[PDB]
Amino acid sequence: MAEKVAVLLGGTSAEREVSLLSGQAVLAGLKEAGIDAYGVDTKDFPVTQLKEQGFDKVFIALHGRGGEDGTLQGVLEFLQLPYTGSGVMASALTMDKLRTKLVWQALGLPISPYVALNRQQFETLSPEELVACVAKLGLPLIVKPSHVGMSKVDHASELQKALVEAFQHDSDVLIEKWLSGPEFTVAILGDEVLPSIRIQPPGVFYDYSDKTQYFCPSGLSDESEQQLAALALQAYHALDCSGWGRVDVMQDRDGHFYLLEVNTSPGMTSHSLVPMAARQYGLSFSQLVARILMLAD
Amino acid sequence: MAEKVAVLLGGTSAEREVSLLSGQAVLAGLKEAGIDAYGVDTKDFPVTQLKEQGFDKVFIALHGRGGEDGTLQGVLEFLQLPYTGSGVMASALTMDKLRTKLVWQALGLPISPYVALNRQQFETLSPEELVACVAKLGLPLIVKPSHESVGMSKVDHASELQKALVEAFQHDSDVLIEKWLSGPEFTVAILGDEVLPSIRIQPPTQYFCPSGLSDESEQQLAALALQAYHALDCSGWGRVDVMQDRDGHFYLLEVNTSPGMTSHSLVPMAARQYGLSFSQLVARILMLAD
Numbered sequence: 245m246a247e248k249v250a251v252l253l254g255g256t257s258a259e260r261e262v263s264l265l266s267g268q269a270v271l272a273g274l275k276e277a278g279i280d281a282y283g284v285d286t287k288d289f290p291v292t293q294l295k296e297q298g299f300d301k302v303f304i305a306l307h308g309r310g311g312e313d314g315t316l317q318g319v320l321e322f323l324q325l326p327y328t329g330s331g332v333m334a335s336a337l338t339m340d341k342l343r344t345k346l347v348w349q350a351l352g353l354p355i356s357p358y359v360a361l362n363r364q365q366f367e368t369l370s371p372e373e374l375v376a377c378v379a380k381l382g383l384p385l386i387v388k389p390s391h392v393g394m395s396k397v398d399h400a401s402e403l404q405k406a407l408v409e410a411f412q413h414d415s416d417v418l419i420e421k422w423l424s425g426p427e428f429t430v431a432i433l434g435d436e437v438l439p440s441i442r443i444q445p446p447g448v449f450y451d452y453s454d455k456t457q458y459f460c461p462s463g464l465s466d467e468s469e470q471q472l473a474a475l476a477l478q479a480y481h482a483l484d485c486s487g488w489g490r491v492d493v494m495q496d497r498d499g500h501f502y503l504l505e506v507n508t509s510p511g512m513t514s515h516s517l518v519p520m521a522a523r524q525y526g527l528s529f530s531q532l533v534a535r536i537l538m539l540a541d
Numbered sequence: 542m543a544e545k546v547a548v549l550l551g552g553t554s555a556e557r558e559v560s561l562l563s564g565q566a567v568l569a570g571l572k573e574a575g576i577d578a579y580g581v582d583t584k585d586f587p588v589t590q591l592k593e594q595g596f597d598k599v600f601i602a603l604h605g606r607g608g609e610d611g612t613l614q615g616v617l618e619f620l621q622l623p624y625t626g627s628g629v630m631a632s633a634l635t636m637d638k639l640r641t642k643l644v645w646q647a648l649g650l651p652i653s654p655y656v657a658l659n660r661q662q663f664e665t666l667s668p669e670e671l672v673a674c675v676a677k678l679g680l681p682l683i684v685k686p687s688h689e690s691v692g693m694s695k696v697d698h699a700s701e702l703q704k705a706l707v708e709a710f711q712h713d714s715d716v717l718i719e720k721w722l723s724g725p726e727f728t729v730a731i732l733g734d735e736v737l738p739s740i741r742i743q744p745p746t747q748y749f750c751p752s753g754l755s756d757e758s759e760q761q762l763a764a765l766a767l768q769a770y771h772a773l774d775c776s777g778w779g780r781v782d783v784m785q786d787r788d789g790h791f792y793l794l795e796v797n798t799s800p801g802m803t804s805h806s807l808v809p810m811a812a813r814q815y816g817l818s819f820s821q822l823v824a825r826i827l828m829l830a831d
């Protein structure tokens with residue numbers, strides 16, 4: 245018998261608005277392909293009741309907290325409903341910058357040099373020791389929390405300052421070497437790596453708008469794109485991802501690629517990265533979402 | 542109001558019968574400490590209904606799948622009940638032996654030499670080419686599926702390897718081949734930020750608490766166990782497992798995020814040695830859920 249599919253959307257996180265748009269597009273795409281899909285705004289319907297409502301399969305179109313971080317996935321494993329995107333472990337681990345970095349580094353995948361700090365060694369030390377500690381990183385630097393309130397840093401007086409603003413919403417902190425750019429992103433769909441996209445934000449960060457420019461194709465030489473494609477796939481399997489996702493990557497002045505992050509529930513607005521990548525690989529939006537759904541075992 | 546507390550016990554996993562005992566003990570210890578606790582056999586009671594039925598706090602005494610793997614933790618995060626033990630990420634991570642290892646390795650924490658192998662590599666490669674991948678590890682060898690002794694084999698001669706890989710590629714797409722260690726084995730219970738006293742395990746099982754180690758070795762082991770526990774983002778409580786080599790080096794094996802709470806279990810025995818009654822132990826664990 246045919247599947248009843250729930251498209252989860254909206255939610256209660258900071259990214260509710262984008263998620264409303266993503267879910268709306270996913271919904272229209274699935275109905276175009278003949279899938280018996282139904283929208284579910286999770287602000288108002290409890291995800292713990294999907295099974296009672298008669299659903300067979302879940303398409304996850306939520307973003308941020310409670311959507312891509314393992315918690316929803318755990319609910320779905322408890323109910324024994326198949327769902328799109330990565331499982332609990334991968335979904336949660338991709339939110340944790342420190343441990344994502346550790347997994348990659350143990351495998352010898354390229355990451356920007358960094359130094360981790362918790363609040364202990366933070367308060368158990370002062371600026372004359374903190375600067376010697378990072379000295380080997382050079383300048384300038386990025387200070388961010390392990391799990392939004394980050395800074396760029398140019399010389400050694402600026403450091404101490406920015407460290408304390410980072411502990412205002414996290415307890416483990418990363419101090420990374422600054423990379424020149426440019427920034428790229430690589431969508432993965434099952435095992436297929438799609439065309440990369442160059443991203444230029446106006447300021448120093450590609451943080452949380454409307455000005456940001458994107459380039460498809462990305463302008464990389466051909467040899468450069470195979471390297472970035474293979475690396476992306478490795479980085480995605482490294483964290484045990486599956487179904488689909490998006491790997492974020494940055495070049496440095498030397499031209500080498502460094503891994504930043506994997507996003508386990510990407511935006512699916514008409515203006516979003518994955519659909520733009522897919523259209524360039526030659527897939528309609530409708531085929532994209534039918535495929536993601538097919539990849540949910 | 543006194544907070545109403547659910548001790549989750551039983552479940553539907555292989556570890557059910559052990560879990561009924563853990564939960565029965567925890568139930569009795571929370572009551573002795575003045576806590577308004579109720580046993581909840583989650584085989585019979587969903588867990589998605591715990592908020593609706595009026596519970597305020599959850600003590601997890603479930604073991605294995607659906608208990609210590611992040612799925613339960615995810616449900617409780619969604620219902621927003623405070624609960625005992627590690628969060629989603631740590632509970633799930635600790636069931637992935639490969640990635641546990643990778644994290645520890647990158648922090649320079651000591652683990653046994655190993656090789657990891659996925660099904661695609663097993664398919665592509667001849668038995669001899671395999672023996673060649675794991676040669677640098679010597680013999681004997683331990684073969685385990687990567688996902689938490691089902692499918693686990695001790696391999697003494699290179700010609701037993703295939704059979705061991707096959708038995709394990711049953712249960713997982715990822716398998717670990719490790720260097721065997723001559724022991725003995727240790728376990729270090731952690732309770733919040735306190736490291737309790739270790740226990741020597743001598744299997745074929747005798748448990749020794751105290752462990753026999755020098756003070757100076759106990760300090761090393763406690764510090765090492767703490768770092769291994771924080772490396773994986775654990776909190777609340779947990780049990781860390783460690784082995785020695787012939788030379789007395791410690792190597793990390795695993796962190797357990799929902800340990801046994803029967804009268805014959807390790808954590809309770811470490812607690813006893815620390816000067817705690819069982820009632821005190823479970824009350825402390827619950828205080829650490831906020």
Ligand SMILES: Nc1ncnc2c1ncn2[C@@H]1O[C@H](COP(=O)(O)OP(=O)(O)NP(=O)(O)O)[C@@H](O)[C@H]1O
Nearest residue numbers: 356386392420421422423427449450451452504505
């Ligand atoms: N070492 C670095 N050097 C230069 N730019 C960086 C570095 N790390 C991160 N960035 C920039 O900051 C952006 C967002 O940082 P990220 O590493 O995703 O942390 P985050 O807190 O998750 N920010 P957000 O994307 O809002 O989640 C990246 O996409 C880059 O543009």
Ligand SMILES: Nc1ncnc2c1ncn2[C@@H]1O[C@H](COP(=O)(O)OP(=O)(O)NP(=O)(O)O)[C@@H](O)[C@H]1O
Nearest residue numbers: 653683685689690691693719720721722726794795
């Ligand atoms: N490298 C090793 N050398 C010697 N003994 C080992 C090694 N790895 C595992 N063992 C023994 O096997 C036991 C189980 O190890 P573990 O790494 O937890 O695998 P497992 O499949 O989780 N088995 P269990 O914990 O019983 O589910 C340990 O407690 C050790 O006594």
Ligand SMILES: [Mg+2]
Nearest residue numbers: 450451492505
């Ligand atoms: Mg980010």
Ligand SMILES: [Mg+2]
Nearest residue numbers: 689690795797
């Ligand atoms: Mg184990």
Ligand code: NA
Nearest residue numbers: 312335338508
């Ligand atoms: Na994620």
Ligand code: NA
Nearest residue numbers: 609632635798
């Ligand atoms: Na666990």
Ligand code: NA
Nearest residue numbers: 788789790791
């Ligand atoms: Na030595």
